[PDB]
Amino acid sequence: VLDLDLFRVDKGGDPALIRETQEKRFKDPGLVDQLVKADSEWRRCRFRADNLNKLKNLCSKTIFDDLTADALANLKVSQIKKVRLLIDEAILKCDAERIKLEAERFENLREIGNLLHPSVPISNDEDVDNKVERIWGDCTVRKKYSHVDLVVMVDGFEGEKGAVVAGSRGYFLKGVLVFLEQALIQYALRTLGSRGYIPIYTPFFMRKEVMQEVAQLSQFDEELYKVIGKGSEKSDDNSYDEKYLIATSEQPIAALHRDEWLRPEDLPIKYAGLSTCFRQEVGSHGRDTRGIFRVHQFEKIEQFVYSSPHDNKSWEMFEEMITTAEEFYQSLGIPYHIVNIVSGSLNHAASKKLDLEAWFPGSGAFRELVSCSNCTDYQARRLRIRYGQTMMDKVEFVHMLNATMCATTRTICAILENYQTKKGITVPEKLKEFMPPGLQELIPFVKPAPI
Amino acid sequence: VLDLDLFRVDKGGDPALIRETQEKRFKDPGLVDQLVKADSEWRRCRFRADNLNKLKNLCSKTIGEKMKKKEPVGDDESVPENVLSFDDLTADALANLKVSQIKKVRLLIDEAILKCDAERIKLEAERFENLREIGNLLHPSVPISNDEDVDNKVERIWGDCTVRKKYSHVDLVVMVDGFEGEKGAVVAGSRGYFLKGVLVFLEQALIQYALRTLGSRGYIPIYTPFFMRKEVMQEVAQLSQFDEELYKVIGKGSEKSDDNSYDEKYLIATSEQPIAALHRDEWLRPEDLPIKYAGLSTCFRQEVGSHGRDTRGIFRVHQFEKIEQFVYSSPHDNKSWEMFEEMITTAEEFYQSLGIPYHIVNIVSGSLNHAASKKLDLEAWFPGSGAFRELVSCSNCTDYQARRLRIRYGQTKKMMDKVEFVHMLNATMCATTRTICAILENYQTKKGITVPEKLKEFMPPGLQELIPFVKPAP
RNA sequence: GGAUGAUCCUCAGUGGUCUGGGGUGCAAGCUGUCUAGCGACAGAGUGGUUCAAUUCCACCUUU
Ligand SMILES: Nc1ncnc2c1ncn2[C@@H]1O[C@H](COP(=O)(O)OP(=O)(O)NP(=O)(O)O)[C@@H](O)[C@H]1O
Ligand SMILES: Nc1ncnc2c1ncn2[C@@H]1O[C@H](COP(=O)(O)OP(=O)(O)NP(=O)(O)O)[C@@H](O)[C@H]1O
Numbered sequence: 001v002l003d004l005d006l007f008r009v010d011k012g013g014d015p016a017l018i019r020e021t022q023e024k025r026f027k028d029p030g031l032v033d034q035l036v037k038a039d040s041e042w043r044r045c046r047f048r049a050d051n052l053n054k055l056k057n058l059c060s061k062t063i064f065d066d067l068t069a070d071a072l073a074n075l076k077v078s079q080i081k082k083v084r085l086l087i088d089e090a091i092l093k094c095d096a097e098r099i100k101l102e103a104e105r106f107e108n109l110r111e112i113g114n115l116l117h118p119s120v121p122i123s124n125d126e127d128v129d130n131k132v133e134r135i136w137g138d139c140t141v142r143k144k145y146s147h148v149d150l151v152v153m154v155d156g157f158e159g160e161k162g163a164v165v166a167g168s169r170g171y172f173l174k175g176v177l178v179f180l181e182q183a184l185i186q187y188a189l190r191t192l193g194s195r196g197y198i199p200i201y202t203p204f205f206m207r208k209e210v211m212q213e214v215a216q217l218s219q220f221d222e223e224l225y226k227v228i229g230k231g232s233e234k235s236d237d238n239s240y241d242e243k244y245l246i247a248t249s250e251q252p253i254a255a256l257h258r259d260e261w262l263r264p265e266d267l268p269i270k271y272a273g274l275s276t277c278f279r280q281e282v283g284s285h286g287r288d289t290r291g292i293f294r295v296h297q298f299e300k301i302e303q304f305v306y307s308s309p310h311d312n313k314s315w316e317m318f319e320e321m322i323t324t325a326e327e328f329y330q331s332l333g334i335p336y337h338i339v340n341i342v343s344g345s346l347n348h349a350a351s352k353k354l355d356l357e358a359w360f361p362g363s364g365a366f367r368e369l370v371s372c373s374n375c376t377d378y379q380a381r382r383l384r385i386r387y388g389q390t391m392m393d394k395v396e397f398v399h400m401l402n403a404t405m406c407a408t409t410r411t412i413c414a415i416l417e418n419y420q421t422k423k424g425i426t427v428p429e430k431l432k433e434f435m436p437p438g439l440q441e442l443i444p445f446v447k448p449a450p451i
Numbered sequence: 452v453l454d455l456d457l458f459r460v461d462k463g464g465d466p467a468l469i470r471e472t473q474e475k476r477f478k479d480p481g482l483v484d485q486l487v488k489a490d491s492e493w494r495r496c497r498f499r500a501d502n503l504n505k506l507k508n509l510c511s512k513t514i515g516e517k518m519k520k521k522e523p524v525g526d527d528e529s530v531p532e533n534v535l536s537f538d539d540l541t542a543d544a545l546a547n548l549k550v551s552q553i554k555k556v557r558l559l560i561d562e563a564i565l566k567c568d569a570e571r572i573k574l575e576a577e578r579f580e581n582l583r584e585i586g587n588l589l590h591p592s593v594p595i596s597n598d599e600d601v602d603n604k605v606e607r608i609w610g611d612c613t614v615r616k617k618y619s620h621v622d623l624v625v626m627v628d629g630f631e632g633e634k635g636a637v638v639a640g641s642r643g644y645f646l647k648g649v650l651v652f653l654e655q656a657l658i659q660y661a662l663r664t665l666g667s668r669g670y671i672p673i674y675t676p677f678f679m680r681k682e683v684m685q686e687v688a689q690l691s692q693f694d695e696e697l698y699k700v701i702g703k704g705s706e707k708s709d710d711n712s713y714d715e716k717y718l719i720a721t722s723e724q725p726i727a728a729l730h731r732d733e734w735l736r737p738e739d740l741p742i743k744y745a746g747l748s749t750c751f752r753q754e755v756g757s758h759g760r761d762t763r764g765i766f767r768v769h770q771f772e773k774i775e776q777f778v779y780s781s782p783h784d785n786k787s788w789e790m791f792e793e794m795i796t797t798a799e800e801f802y803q804s805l806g807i808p809y810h811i812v813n814i815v816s817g818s819l820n821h822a823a824s825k826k827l828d829l830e831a832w833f834p835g836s837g838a839f840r841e842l843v844s845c846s847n848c849t850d851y852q853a854r855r856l857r858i859r860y861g862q863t864k865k866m867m868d869k870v871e872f873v874h875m876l877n878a879t880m881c882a883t884t885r886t887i888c889a890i891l892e893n894y895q896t897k898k899g900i901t902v903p904e905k906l907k908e909f910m911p912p913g914l915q916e917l918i919p920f921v922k923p924a925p
Numbered sequence: 926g927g928a929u930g931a932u933c934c935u936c937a938g939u940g941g942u943c944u945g946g947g948g949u950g951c952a953a954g955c956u957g958u959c960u961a962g963c964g965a966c967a968g969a970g971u972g973g974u975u976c977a978a979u980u981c982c983a984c985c986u987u988u
Contacts (some may be wrong), residue, residue, distance in 0.1 A: 050958055063976055063977070077976085081976060165676055167680050167704075174674065175671055178662065181674070182662065185655065186659065200645060200648070200651065201651050201654070204749070206638055225701065226700065228699040228701065229640070233755050245700065255638050256631070258638075280703055281706060282703055282705075282707070282708070284706060285705075285707050
């Protein structure tokens, strides 16, 4: 949620930059001017409300014109009371007004995107105007057998029984791949565990009031599932509470330090989120439908950092994190290329996102496997997470960063497609440590490819 | 669900066994008097239906005879009378009526067929409603009482020694800096928790360990979905569970912007449930000897029963990982009851392997869930808390869930004799948080916690030997 | 029923826009509006009775 002073030309900022940054995001402006009107009205109405209460008190201080009052002392009892009761009608009306404006001003503010780093590409088309920054590994080789057939050929995936139980995209990951999953977990956990990231296991659902602070509408509409609880552990209570399953570990970790004052000294704080993530995936029908590349439920290990805003500690930590992931996917021997995402494809929170598109040889194309984002002070202001616990003056919030270390399932797929042979898939050297006796060497085929 | 025939007196079994089963379960036996009622009426509607069909054919037959006796005869308009009453008819009457009258009467029979169809459906539905909440048969060896603490019976004890220590799991989880209760209550509501740092590894160890243990003993590792469709969850859970355990999740039921419809799902409270639904509506082959599955899944409980119990730590939470041993077995040669006793020793050995003192218990009838025929509760000793807590449950549901999910013993050896369903059993290998609490109370020191030999292997470098305190106990 | 939430802390008092004693800081904290700035005004959990609520009452929250 951007600072309101950026809309006041009276105060520090200018909205013309906001508008421009909305256009760059390719979200229709106006929202900025709906904001500014609603705010300006709310100032006038908070000014009136003030002045009226100033008279409300002016009159008990004293104890036929009302538009504006002077140092009044003439008349009393009935003559003053009537005026004060008429003023009270005025405050009721200015109260209804204020509440309406406040609510609707913030309605507009809620869906205005964060500021953009200059380096971000300014276009709406992603295929065309996305820029690759770095390229690693062997990016042109191919192996023909896709991750679907591969996942089947190992006897690790039940897509039919998963469609029965959970209803399309639902799945039973079975046997050896479970150990393979676990490996990736353990490996990523140890990696980050060494680099000063503290591991953390999060809750999977939230209290809405909290979720609303960490998610934008779109996500509520086409991503977040909703949970319905009792909101009390008594049989007497037939009341209900709406909770929401998390789509990322970013969300629960972001809220971890809600409404706190974080000291500059302890401030560079790295969290290693461990969480299962539920997404409805309403955007994408008929996309990656067979395998487990794209599914409604999957474990994920995430890098979330709270950083100081002042210098460029945020954007150094950023470049560090992205490079962190790089070293992870370099170590498993996966070829990839880093891409800089266009302004249209950024979510409100982010100021800039660099994604790691890994090479899928069997499929013969580049699929996304890691995103990295710097939200700056956007989430922070909303979660009221400031910088230092109270000197004066001018309240400054932290900068918050979030990037995925490993998305267990899509990474598993990348492994399968890149390390296939004739017997099966070769286990990359890093994981051999954590793969059980028998798979340390390889992952053997036991089933044939479906036709 | 049970078998209807053992409700039917003219058929095999007796229903006074069932009413007795209820009395032992301390539930209502009047439920069965309702079952027997709706079944009786449903039979009546079956009988009439049949008799009615017979008549319909007899109308098409008498119609047959008309053309032979005369192409023209009598009157083609007149309406029928008295005959219509379908309780009692002949062929004489049908022979008397002209063609037209028999044709219309045939239509009235067809109307009455549809009326039966409807009413038959209503009875079937009501009988079922009665049947859902009727408990499985009890094994004699199960104790027969309602309260558990007084009338539970201990069968086995292992390990040392009803020993005591200090620092409950409540204080332990804090002292190691692995638990954030206050900020997790803010995020996820009451009882919610952030598990952090070292415990995360500890948990991951347990998982990794149990998974290799069972993965060695022939169990097939399996990762379940965490939510199930209404239909199927309804097949695997009972009403009280829906009221006081299963959270309700709501999806869109279609991945198109266009779609405004929603689909109601439910989050699982055990891996039992998605695994039971793995092989729904299937004929399990006799050759595939007891199929063993290692279920790895997080489990959501609303935990509505209990208010103000174990509120501080991670002992009772609304979300926790769990490893379950689930086997499909044969009902013949008491094979399930053997594997039952095997599976319990399996968990026994694991917890022996972790040096955790415990004792096996037979659970009383009055606390048993409908599905189970008999449940074994491995209760591990908490020195720091100073008591024994339920850590593991293993249950043999026999054919109950089986009958419900339509999972039969293959084609069976013979046909047209009686369809026999499989026996299915479910047991918890590891309850990560409760296990973690068990370990923290059993390996505690003053330096921190000692890592159990087996887990040392899976701990990351530096945490293989022990886990150090960093904070003081409140 | 008691305690509580936002006027430096603390005890006591009180319908007069708060008072007093003791302690602490500086030469009295937080939010918001107005003014170019100086600075002024409004807000004290929510409502009521009262012109007037720190008090009285209703009420809640956390405990
Ligand atoms: N349906 C899904 N199943 C599994 N992982 C997913 C899914 N959608 C997104 N992700 C994860 O999100 C990470 C990076 O993409 P992210 O930006 O988080 O979501 P996104 O941009 O919506 N990706 P997509 O929706 O697949 O184009 C990947 O490493 C994936 O693991
Ligand atoms: N509130 C809870 N939090 C975490 N795990 C639980 C909880 N309740 C039960 N379990 C797990 O499930 C098994 C306990 O017995 P089970 O029969 O599944 O549930 P239960 O008998 O209802 N136990 P409880 O609900 O604590 O009285 C153990 O493996 C537990 O760790």
